[PDB]
Amino acid sequence: VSSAAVQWSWDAEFEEVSDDSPEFGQPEIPVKKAQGFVPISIEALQDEA
Amino acid sequence: MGLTKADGGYLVPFQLDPTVIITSNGSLNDIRRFARQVVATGDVWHG
C-alpha cells in the first residue's frame, strides 16, 4: 500500500474547508523462477574424479 | 558430458604399468654346460 499526505490550507474566519481526501496505490511484485541442467553419462560419474 | 576429452574426459586419471614387457623370442642353448672352457690370454689358443 502506498499513499501521500493531506493538503492543509491557511484559511480565514468563517470559511469552508477544501476537500483533502488522499489517494492510494498498490505496488505489485510477481515472482519468477530460473533453471539449469547438466546431463552426464553413467561411465563418467564412476570414472572421472 | 561423457568421456570425450573436451566434454569432461580430461578429468580421468592416467593409468600406466611401468614394467617393460620383452617381446623377443630369444634362444636357449646347452653347449656351454657340456663344452670345455679354457682361459685365453692372447688371441690364439694352441694345442
Side-chain angles (χ1 to χ4, degrees):
Chain A
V1 193
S2 176
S3 66
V6 177
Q7 173 92 17
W8 292 57
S9 47
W10 278 113
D11 297 322
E13 194 178 2
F14 295 126
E15 175 193 328
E16 285 188 356
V17 295
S18 61
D19 176 21
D20 308 330
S21 76
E23 69 276 16
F24 291 77
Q26 292 86 16
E28 209 157 27
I29 311 292
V31 168
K32 285 129 172 163
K33 56 149 208 172
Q35 278 170 166
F37 195 57
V38 167
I40 177 157
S41 166
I42 287 179
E43 296 147 332
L45 262 170
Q46 65 182 357
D47 272 352
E48 293 186 351
Chain B
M1 192 205 158
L3 283 175
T4 301
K5 283 311 171 83
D7 294 328
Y10 279 117
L11 298 185
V12 309
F14 197 99
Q15 192 195 0
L16 178 68
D17 197 1
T19 67
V20 174
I21 311 167
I22 297 91
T23 64
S24 61
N25 302 346
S27 165
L28 188 58
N29 194 316
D30 290 353
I31 290 156
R32 257 192 189 274
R33 68 184 68 188
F34 303 144
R36 163 195 168 189
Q37 294 83 14
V38 70
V39 60
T41 51
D43 53 328
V44 179
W45 182 97
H46 292 280

